[PDB]
């Protein structure tokens, strides 16, 4: 058992027709100090998998180290490393969640809510949640923490359901994260100005976007 | 200070009349007449607008108010207490009855507890 | 203070027939006011014309049915492939339980299929492993809102023949498997209307000598 | 106190009452009466807190002579006992309630009729053909629902309350000394010396 | 919240930011913090919102009858009335209140009331938990006699990053104005003081 | 509960949902959340629903009292100033969180109203439990000069997002438009999105299933004469 | 300890064509101790209806104070209260108590004499009213009534058969809960008749 | 919760209720409390219901391993050991248990031990456990006999569930009878408590209280 | 359990020790033998937390038997109650202890001398002419420290015994039902089966 | 406590002031919190004395042991086991080290570890109670590839309003530069950074 100490806030996520999309901001938070303004919370596993992690950032930064290393790990005596036997969004995931249930249960966890994007070999997106305690959900479109109360509302207006997929583009949904974003930042005390997105897509891989900012603001009418 | 007269000023005199209500209806016949007529499908109370000066916009003083929606009243006599008594009766038909049964009183209840105020003012001290 | 648990919500229910058994579940995940998944299934088939769901803690209800799916797996390779019987499952899903006495696993689990005289049955088990055979229950959130009316409706409690005004009891006839679905369905429908936390999606397996079918139905979503 | 027992046969009512008092470590006294006469027909008995209930029971029984000199009228044991229920209800929103339960066996001379009242310190009053407080009942109570009819005489009602003592004496950890029992129809109160 | 006065040649400015959260949730981002007692005495509020305003409201009232009776109060005079009711309802009251007015005779004044209900005057004030982070800022920075650019300046820095490290702070920079000339109610928006 | 306000053209509109729980039991379906203080001035309420609407009631009550009086039509800031000094006296006890629009002879105004008795400004506003889903809809949408149609549809939606991802709302969107040189038009189940589909059984009984005691005619009349 | 759920208990309010009805349970109890079968937790002031559950104690209480009350607004109005009336003031009743409650669940249930609409009407401790066109349920077994009246209730039943609806609905509630049952009572109510009916139900 | 076993001429008779409750909810009414240990031995199920099922199944593998072993059926005596040593190894670990073991045998006769989860074992002609065991030892107590006949043994079993039903909220259901002879026990049916109440009435003249 | 007492006389040591069982609410048992013969002239009765006063007692029982066995002889009186002390000293520190208290009334054979012994679950070993544990001292010792004499015979030390009960049943407020009585002399140990 | 390290264009200096506080009592008014770990690698201590000392001779000793079998470490190598330290007894510690070192590969570099075991690298940073009151003037006045007198200057300007501000934080002011000419120890009083 302990208390989270230096913290990042919501990373949001969605499925769209020919992948996923993932973001989340720049921020590492010591209460309600905003301290670190350059942390990276996305954090990349070859060439179809991104996985976004907030809560605890001193365990972030061990999930980080644990997935270099499956990395390392997956190409000892793998000639098909960078093929067939290249690691997977969804082994990835397990792994993940494996880890999160095992340290919940000696009452040790490590304090995150992670949402891990990618597509697998076959072209199908994926998309899954897991947290501190273990649990794990699927969904069109994922959040934390305050994500999960003011994103997903947004972002479940473009898809409702599994069906709303195929008709949802990537500039949609890239429209639809961004201002999700924004509204973020209004809202939410603990977040920031500056945020990561990453795409995953089918056809064009893994697009990677730093240091993009929340714009067209509206405050005047104060 | 302190209200030191905390005994009737209206008693019965050796006859058994009440001196000082006699004489308030003495002040009700000096005023200016006021009359109501009830018909099948409503009623009417009306009155004389009788202005102290020419000057004086009589629009400004309200001899026939109202009390509820669905209830008014004009007088005859002083003025003043007539404001005076709009003002408890308005007052009375909410704390007595509509902050306890969510409904305006009827015209009787009403008239009731103007009355039982009225009463008072003819007893206590 | 870590809290090792939670509550996911969610509502199952199971009813066995006369040669078939069905376990029905909404597919709504939340925590608190906020909905996780609109569609996360939560009854599973363990092989073997076994079917499952551990409700309530869904970390602890994902962790049992991995470990008796599991358990399903080395029972063919230790005993030549023989196929185990829904009697011998629930005895083995009570030591898997029970294993766990002194920190549970915080799930009330329902087990269906047909027993070794091709009969139906249902198996119900508290979070530290006591159980028993039963023709109906209901289990999770809504679960006293479902009781009361399988009680009058499925086995005809408080219901008499007319004209002999409490003398003769209303015959206990037997249910086919669509007026069972009727049943079922009528039950969620009205558990939705009166429980914040059911809603979404039904969906229903139902198990016979053939094999394990599937279906699901629509509920309200707000 | 501890137990209190109540049972109203064809024409009496039967009360009986534990005799002991007990400090904590020592038990003061075998021979306490733990009840009042509230009116020549009207008798009460009580149990709870120290104190509160000899309190409670006299405060009672002074309000029930005053009316009877009043009015020159006895009143019936349903009037006597929505009286002490109102106090009751009354005093469980005080600043200090009463803690006592009571019984209240009365017969009707207008009616010619036993009643029994049980009413516990929240004014929870009900009318009963057999009653009791605290754990009493949960010894008792099968018995009486068992042998009780509304017929019986008051040699029955008798016996079935030493059949009940007898289960409480068996099965209750601690001694309560016997109990006083009275009895009370249209000749008045009287109490057995031999029980 | 992020609260500043400052006094300057021609008299005294008050500042403040414009956020109001419920722990982490943002209730409002443009909320008004300076808050007028009476004409030429504004003030800055924090601490509980329902208190402070509850003690501005009683202020005003208490200042209004002043003015029927005896023409004018003074700013001392003010907080005075702002220290009875936060001295007096210590046990009651979370609050934290810098008085700012402009006099002819006195000129620009401000007054700092923390929580126990003391009264400090001084040439400048800075209250609310972003202030923690701004003073070292402020006592490099602030002079006597600036002039009103300068000062504006001034209040627009340190208000900037009291922001910049405070979670509780942010919104707009709005400024209130107390001078011989009158009362000119300034605004700064992000896109403008982020970028200093 | 989710209730929102919004500011337009020419006036303020408010809307509520109309779910009302106890726990995570839905007591009633079709609950009435928008109050009337007096005619055009009207607030929602969430937290302890006896408090909000004996709150409303009571200052309700008080001004109309004050408008006989005065001789003027209600102020909004009467409202509030009432509002806010009794629930502030009353240190947060009386669980009452306010949305509190109207419009008077000074304009139209829009205020929210916390239970501690601290009070806000806005142009969009909302509070409850399903607030974080109003107001990401209302900070992704609203403008300055709203039209009367562009508000009812910003509020209403705002309130939908309410109802399908928070627990705490749901079933209908109740309206109430208030505009200046108008008469209030409140607009009960402006939207029902939440109709319950037909059931697949009819679950009417035999008449005589239920075993009966005994039967009795209730006398509900006065003593009779003669 | 929690003192709705001491005594235990029942009630449920329905409505049907020109026609209301209004039941409950009998049980009166001490935690775990059945004590009393003959509770009763109905009550009439006139044509007006009103069922009380909760702590005994204030259910006593309250029957004598709306007795009270309804008795003075009968002498001074000059004719009976009316159920939207009545409710108006158990709704003030309990208000009025806001931090010092009684622990009840009232439910009232009526015809208008006037227009002949049927009404019923719920509270919480602490007066906030519930007006259901459907049903009104209140109790320890509150979960299982509204799981029971959200499936077998249908809109515009005739009185013999909203009374086997009402009497199935409190039945099978009460059977899943420990604290309610020892016997029921449903009122069926009409604009000028009324029948009482006491149900034969399992006594464990 | 109600459950009892008695001793007499004919053997044991044990009598449980069948309800089970999460607070005021009625979680079952169909439960069986009675455990069949083996075709000799039975457990009454009281406290946790976990740890009755499960520890009085083991008890049962325990039993059949020692005459597998010994070649001799396991007394009363050691079987009701084995438990409650068992037990008192938990002890403070929080297991719930109130049970009577029962049994027949040459040696011993007919025999019941009381075993509970602190640890304590006691041997004992009539035991009564439950949230209605006041109700039931009632009862018991007022009509028990040594040379009570195995049918009027088998009602008064009954008929004390039947009352502890009544009066207990936590108790009822259905009633569970068994009768244990040296060949093994012979179990006597279900018994409804709402349909047996009635008939017990009527046949008795009992429960005059009560309205039928 | 409840009251144990003991009474070493002229040439016998007497333990009584009461038969109730009480699991809270229900006296479960009125004929519980809260004793164990440890070796043919040494019986040790006990009381404490329920089922640690069985296990200990048996416990110790069995380890005595293992001893004579081994040595074909009976240890003496005082050895058995240090071993004893030293297994409940141990245990006081354990993880979970033993709550039980003891006495051991031996006749030691070597001396020609009956000895009570005294102690307690922390591991307070007393020898005494006459002792108890818990409140049984309370109501008993006053008249125990009155009328013993050092030279009492078996019967007189029964008599002084059963006005000890006596005065435990009219002042102490729990039903212990009684007590079983052991004698421990030369010749061994038995039961007194009227008392 | 008031301690920070910044990187300038010919290497690192670090910072921190000399006060030990038990209460309210000063029980050392001349600690030396600039600790070294290796020859060009040294740390500032904050949080528990007894756990930063701990944690700071365990490091020692792994960069000797590393020195000896594979040469020198790399700051960054240090700030590892620094965080490896921290990180797996996040439990039972209460430390917070800033880590500063040079090597001529990597010239100047500073990494902070707060309380979680987190690692941050970083182009300055400061740490200590004292350090919440000199955000504002430390994001203000921080320049990169600052010359050594400019460095000194913004160290000693920073840590003087630490301690003016900071109770806990006082005395004199150390410096330890770190550059490729070797290390220097710098110390200033208070009669030389009060009246700046
Ligand atoms: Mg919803
Ligand atoms: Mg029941
Ligand atoms: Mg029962
Ligand atoms: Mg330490
Ligand atoms: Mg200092």
Same mark, same amino acid.
Request: contains cysteine.
């Given at each position: ?222 | 200070? #302190? ?22 209806? #003495? ?40 009390? #509820? ?37 009827? #015209? ?18 | ?222 | ?195 | ?196 | ?226 | ?42 009550? *009439?002031?006139? *044509? ?157 | ?212």
């Amino acid at each position: 058992t302990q208390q989270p100490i230096v913290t990042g806030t919501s990373v949001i996520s969605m499925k769209y027709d020919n992948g996923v999309i993932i973001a989340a901001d720049n921020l590492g938070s010591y209460g309600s100090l905003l301290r670190f303004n350059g942390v990276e919370r996305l954090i990349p596993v070859g060439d179809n998998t991104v996985v976004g992690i907030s809560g605890d950032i001193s365990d972030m930064q061990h999930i980080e180290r644990l997935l270099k290393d499956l990395v390392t790990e997956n190409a000892y005596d793998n000639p098909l490393a960078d093929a067939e036997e290249a690691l997977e969004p969804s082994y990835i995931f397990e792994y993940l969640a494996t880890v999160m249930y095992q340290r919940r249960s000696k009452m040790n966890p490590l304090w995150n809510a992670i949402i891990v994007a990618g597509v697998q070999s076959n072209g199908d997106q994926f998309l899954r949640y897991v947290n501190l305690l273990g649990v794990t959900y699927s969904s069109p479109t994922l959040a934390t923490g305050f994500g999960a109360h003011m994103a997903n509302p947004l972002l479940r207006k473009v898809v409702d359901r599994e069906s709303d997929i195929p008709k949802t583009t990537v500039q949609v949904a890239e429209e639809a994260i961004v201002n999700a974003m924004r509204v973020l930042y209004y809202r939410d005390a603990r977040s920031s100005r500056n945020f990561s997105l990453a795409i995953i897509d089918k056809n064009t891989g893994l697009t990677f976007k730093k240091n993009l900012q929340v714009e067209n603001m509206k405050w005047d009418f104060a | 200070m #302190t209200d030191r007269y905390s005994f009737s000023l209206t008693t019965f005199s050796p006859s058994g009349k009440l001196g000082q209500i006699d004489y308030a209806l #003495t002040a009700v016949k000096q005023g200016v007449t006021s009359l109501g007529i009830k018909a099948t499908n409503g009623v009417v109370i009306a009155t004389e607008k009788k202005s102290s000066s020419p000057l004086a916009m009589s629009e400004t003083l309200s001899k026939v108010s109202l009390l #509820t929606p669905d209830i008014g009243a004009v007088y005859s006599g002083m003025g003043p207490d007539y404001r005076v008594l709009v003002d408890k009766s308005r007052k009375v038909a909410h704390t007595s009855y509509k902050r306890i049964y969510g409904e305006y009183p009827p #015209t009787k209840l009403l008239v009731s507890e103007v009355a039982k105020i009225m009463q008072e003012a003819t007893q206590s001290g | 203070q870590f809290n090792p648990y939670g509550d996911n919500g969610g509502t199952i229910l199971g009813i066995a027939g006369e040669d078939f058994a069905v376990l029905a579940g909404d597919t709504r995940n939340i925590t608190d006011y906020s909905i996780n998944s609109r569609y996360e299934p939560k009854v599973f088939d363990c092989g073997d014309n076994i079917v499952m769901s551990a409700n309530g803690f869904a970390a602890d209800g994902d962790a049992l049915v991995k470990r008796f799916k599991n358990s399903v797996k080395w029972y063919h390779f230790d005993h030549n492939d023989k196929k185990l019987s829904i009697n011998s499952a629930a005895r083995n899903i009570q030591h898997l339980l029970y294993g766990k006495r002194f920190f549970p696993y915080y799930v009330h689990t329902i087990i269906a299929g047909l027993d070794e005289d091709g009969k139906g049955a249902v198996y119900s088990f508290d979070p530290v492993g006591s159980y028993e055979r039963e023709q109906c229950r209901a289990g999770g959130a809504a679960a006293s809102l479902i009781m009361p009316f399988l009680d009058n409706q499925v086995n005809f409690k408080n219901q008499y023949e007319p004209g002999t005004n409490g003398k003769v009891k209303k015959p206990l006839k037997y249910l086919s498997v669509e007026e069972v679905i009727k049943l079922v369905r009528d039950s969620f429908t009205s558990a939705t209307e009166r429980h914040i936390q059911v809603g979404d999606g039904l969906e229903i397996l139902i198990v016979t000598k053939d094999g394990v079918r599937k279906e699901f139905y629509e509920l309200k979503r707000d | 106190m501890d137990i209190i027992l109540g049972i109203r046969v064809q024409d009496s009512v039967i009360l009986a009452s534990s005799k002991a008092v007990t400090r904590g470590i020592s038990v003061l006294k075998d021979s306490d009466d733990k009840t009042r006469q509230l009116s020549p027909h009207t008798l009460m008995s009580f149990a709870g807190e120290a104190g509160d209930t000899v309190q409670f029971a006299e405060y009672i029984q002074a309000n029930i002579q005053l009316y009877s000199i009043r009015e020159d009228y006895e009143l019936s044991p349903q009037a006597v006992s929505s009286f002490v229920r109102q106090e009751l209800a009354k005093s469980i929103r005080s600043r200090r309630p009463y803690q006592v339960n009571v019984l209240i066996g009365g017969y009707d001379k207008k009616k010619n009729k036993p009643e029994l009242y049980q009413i516990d310190y929240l004014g929870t009053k009900v009318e009963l053909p057999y009653g009791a407080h605290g754990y009493s009942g949960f010894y008792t109570f099968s018995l009486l629902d068992h042998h009780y009819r509304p017929d019986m005489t008051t040699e029955e009602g008798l016996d079935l309350l030493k059949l009940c003592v007898q289960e409480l004496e068996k099965r209750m950890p601690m001694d309560f000394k016997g109990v006083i029992v009275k009895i009370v129809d249209k000749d008045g109160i009287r109490q057995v010396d031999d029980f | 919240t992020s609260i500043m006065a400052v006094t300057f040649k021609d008299g005294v400015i008050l500042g403040a930011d414009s956020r109001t959260t419920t722990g982490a949730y943002i209730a409002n981002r443009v909320t008004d913090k300076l808050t007028r007692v009476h004409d030429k005495i504004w003030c800055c509020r924090s601490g509980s919102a329902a208190d402070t305003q509850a003690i501005a409201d009683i202020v005003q009232y208490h200042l209004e009858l002043y003015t029927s009776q005896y023409g004018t109060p003074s700013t001392e005079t003010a907080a005075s009335v702002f220290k009875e009711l936060c001295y007096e309802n210590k046990d009651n009251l979370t609050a934290g209140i810098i008085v700012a007015g402009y006099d002819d005779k006195n000129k620009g004044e401000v007054y700092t009331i923390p929580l126990g209900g003391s009264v400090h005057k001084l040439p400048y004030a800075i209250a609310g938990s972003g202030s923690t982070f701004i003073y070292g800022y402020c006592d490099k920075n602030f002079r006597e006699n600036m002039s009103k650019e300068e000062t504006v300046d001034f209040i627009k820095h340190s208000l900037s990053q009291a922001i910049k490290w405070d979670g509780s702070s942010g919104g707009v920079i709005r400024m209130v104005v107390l001078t011989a000339a009158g009362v000119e109610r300034l605004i700064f928006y992000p896109d403008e003081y982020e970028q200093l | 509960t989710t209730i929102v306000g919004v500011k337009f053209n020419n006036g303020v509109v408010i809307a509520a949902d109309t779910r009302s729980t106890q726990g995570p039991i839905v007591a009633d379906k079709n609950c009435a959340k928008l109050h009337r203080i007096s005619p055009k001035i009207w607030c929602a309420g969430a937290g302890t629903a006896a408090d909000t609407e004996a709150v409303t009631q009571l200052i309700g009550s008080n001004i109309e009292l004050h408008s006989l009086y005065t001789s003027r039509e209600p102020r909004v800031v009467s409202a509030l100033q009432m509002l806010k000094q009794h629930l502030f006296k009353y240190q947060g006890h009386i669980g009452a969180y306010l949305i509190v629009a109207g419009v008077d002879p000074t304009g139209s105004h829009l205020f929210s109203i916390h239970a501690h008795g601290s009070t806000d400004v806005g142009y969009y506003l909302s509070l409850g439990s399903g607030s974080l889903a109003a107001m990401a809809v209302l900070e992704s949408h609203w403008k300055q000069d709203l039209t009367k149609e562009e508000a009812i549809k910003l509020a209403s939606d705002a309130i939908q997002a309410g109802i399908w991802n928070d627990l705490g709302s749901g079933s209908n969107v109740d309206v109430c438009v208030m505009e200046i040189g108008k008469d209030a038009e409140y607009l009960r189940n402006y939207l029902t999105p939440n109709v319950r589909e037909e059931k697949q059984k009819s679950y009417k009984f035999p008449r005589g299933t239920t075993a009966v005691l005994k039967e009795s005619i209730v006398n509900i009349c006065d003593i009779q004469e003669e | 300890s929690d003192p709705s759920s001491i005594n235990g208990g029942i009630v449920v309010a329905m409505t049907g064509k020109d026609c209301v009805a209004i039941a409950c349970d009998l049980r009166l109890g001490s935690q775990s101790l059945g004590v009393s079968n003959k509770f009763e937790k109905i009550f *009439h002031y006139g *044509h007006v209806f009103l069922g009380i559950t909760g702590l005994a104690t204030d259910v006593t209480t309250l029957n004598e104070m709306f007795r009270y009350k309804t008795n003075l607004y009968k002498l001074k109005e000059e004719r009976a209260i009316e159920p939207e009336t009545f409710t108006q003031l158990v709704s003030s009743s309990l208000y009025e108590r806001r931090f010092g409650p009684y622990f009840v669940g009232p439910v009232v249930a009526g015809i208008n004499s006037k227009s002949g609409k049927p009404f019923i009407a719920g509270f919480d401790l602490i007066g906030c009213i519930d007006e259901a066109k459907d049903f009104i349920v209140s109790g320890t077994a509150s979960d299982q009534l509204f799981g029971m009246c959200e499936s077998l209730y249908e809109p515009n039943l005739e009185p013999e058969d909203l009374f086997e609806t009402i009497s199935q609905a409190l039945l099978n509630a009460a059977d899943r809960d420990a604290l309610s049952g020892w016997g029921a009572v449903v009122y069926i109510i009409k604009k000028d008749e009324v029948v009482k009916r006491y149900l034969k139900m399992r006594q464990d | 919760t109600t459950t009892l076993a008695f001793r007499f001429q004919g053997g044991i008779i044990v009598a449980v209720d069948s309800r089970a409750t999460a607070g005021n909810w009625v979680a079952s009414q169909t439960v069986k409390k009675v455990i069949e240990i083996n075709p000799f031995l039975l457990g009454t199920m009281a406290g946790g219901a976990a740890d009755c099922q499960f520890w009085e199944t083991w008890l049962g593998s325990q039993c059949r391993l020692h005459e597998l072993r010994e070649k001799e059926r396991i007394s009363v005596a050691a079987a009701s050991k084995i438990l409650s040593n068992l037990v008192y190894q938990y002890k403070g670990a929080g297991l719930s248990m109130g049970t009577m073991i029962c049994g027949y045998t040459r040696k011993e006769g007919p025999t019941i031990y009381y075993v509970d989860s602190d640890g304590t074992r006691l041997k004992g002609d009539i035991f009564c456990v439950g949230s209605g065991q006041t109700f039931a030892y009632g009862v018991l107590d007022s009509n028990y006999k040594w040379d009570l006949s195995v049918e009027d043994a088998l009602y008064l079993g009954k008929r004390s569930i039947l009352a502890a039903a009544h009066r207990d909220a936590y108790s009822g259901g259905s009633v569970n009878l068994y009768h244990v002879t040296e060949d093994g026990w012979i179990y006597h049916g279900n018994h409804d408590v709402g349909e047996l109440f009635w008939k017990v009435k009527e046949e008795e003249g009992s429960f005059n209280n009560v309205i039928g």
